[PDB]
């Protein structure tokens, strides 16, 4: 509705019998493959990301926000616990750090 991409803001400009909108939008770029999992199994508990997504660079698992790569250590502060590991399809084993 307000340009191609994730809309940030817009600026109006007058025109002869018209209006010109300069739509400032956010476009993702330079994407990279990662191995992802729906949940993390730790101590018999399933951990799900509170706002982000689990990504893996090949050997280590991290949690990052969905629209920008910013890997962080999977802790109990950015994850929440719901159920055991027997239900979620594709849950992987990884440690969850406790601050």
């Amino acid at each position: 509705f307000c340009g191609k991409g994730y809309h940030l803001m817009s600026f109006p400009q007058s025109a002869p019998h018209g209006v010109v909108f300069l739509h400032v939008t956010y476009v993702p770029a330079q994407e990279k493959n990662f191995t992802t999992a729906p949940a993390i199994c730790h101590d018999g508990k399933a951990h799900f990301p509170r706002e982000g997504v689990f990504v893996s660079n090949g050997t280590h698992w991290f949690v990052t926000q969905r629209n920008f790569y910013e890997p962080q250590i999977i802790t109990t502060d950015n994850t929440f616990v719901s159920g055991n590991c027997d239900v979620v399809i594709g849950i992987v084993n990884n440690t969850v750090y406790d601050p």
């Binding site: 340009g3 191609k4 991409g5 940030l8 025109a15 019998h17 018209g18 209006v19 010109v20 909108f21 300069l22 739509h23 400032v24 939008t25 956010y26 476009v27 993702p28 770029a29 330079q30 994407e31 990279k32 493959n33 990662f34 191995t35 992802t36 999992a37 997504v53 990504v55 990052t64 969905r66 629209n67 920008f68 790569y69 594709g90």
Partner: protein, 50 residues
């Protein structure tokens, strides 16, 4: 010619791989929308008859 709908782009889908952006582009685009016309008035008697 037969017009090309666009370039083919096979998305590398698999059940455990995701693509996460590492960068971004701040893109500004233009959208032109007409608002008004020329306000014209025609005297019907003067047009038909002078």
């Amino acid at each position: 010619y037969t017009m090309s709908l666009g370039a083919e782009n096979s998305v590398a889908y698999s059940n455990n791989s995701i693509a996460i952006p590492t960068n971004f582009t701040i893109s500004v685009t233009t959208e032109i929308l007409p608002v008004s016309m020329t306000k014209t008035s025609v005297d019907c008697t003067m047009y038909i008859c002078g």
